[PDB]
Structure 1
Amino acid sequence: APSLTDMSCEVPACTHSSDFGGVAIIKYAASKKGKCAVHSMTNAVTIRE
């Protein structure tokens, strides 16, 4: 699988809006082209993608 490294993040805006009102951006570099899964370790914050 593709492996990331040297990734880091920003949250340009956030709101409590019930319907994915928070938006975030992650910079990265990775070892190849491919498809990559994402998940949140914190149950208090659900991720749409």
Structure 2
Amino acid sequence: TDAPIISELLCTVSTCTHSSDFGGVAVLSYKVEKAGRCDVHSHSNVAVL
């Protein structure tokens, strides 16, 4: 009921280092239909959010 519907997701990148802390930033683009709060995850072992 309070689950928003999100489609046509497109991710880019702007900056990175290796290094030892949170030194990679990315933006997200998506068309919404309802406000709320969703949850995020990256499904591989090479980079943790």
- TM-score under structure 1 normalisation? 0.85
Structure 2, unaligned runs of 5 or more: none
- CA radius of gyration, larger in: 2
> Per residue, is there more strand in 1 or in 2?
1
> What runs of 5+ residues in structure 1 fail to find an aligned partner?
none
Q: Name the SS for the 2:29 alignment partner.
A: strand
Tell me how far apart the structure 1 counterparts of residues 35 and 48 of structure 2 sit (CA, whole Å): 26
Aligned to 1:25: 27
What is the Cα-based RMSD across aligned positions, in Å?
A: 0.9
Q: Any idea what the Cα deviations from partners look like across 1:2-30, whole Å, max 9, x if unmatched? A: 12101101111111012110000010112
Runs of 4+, deviation exceeding 3 Å: none
Total equivalences in the alignment: 47
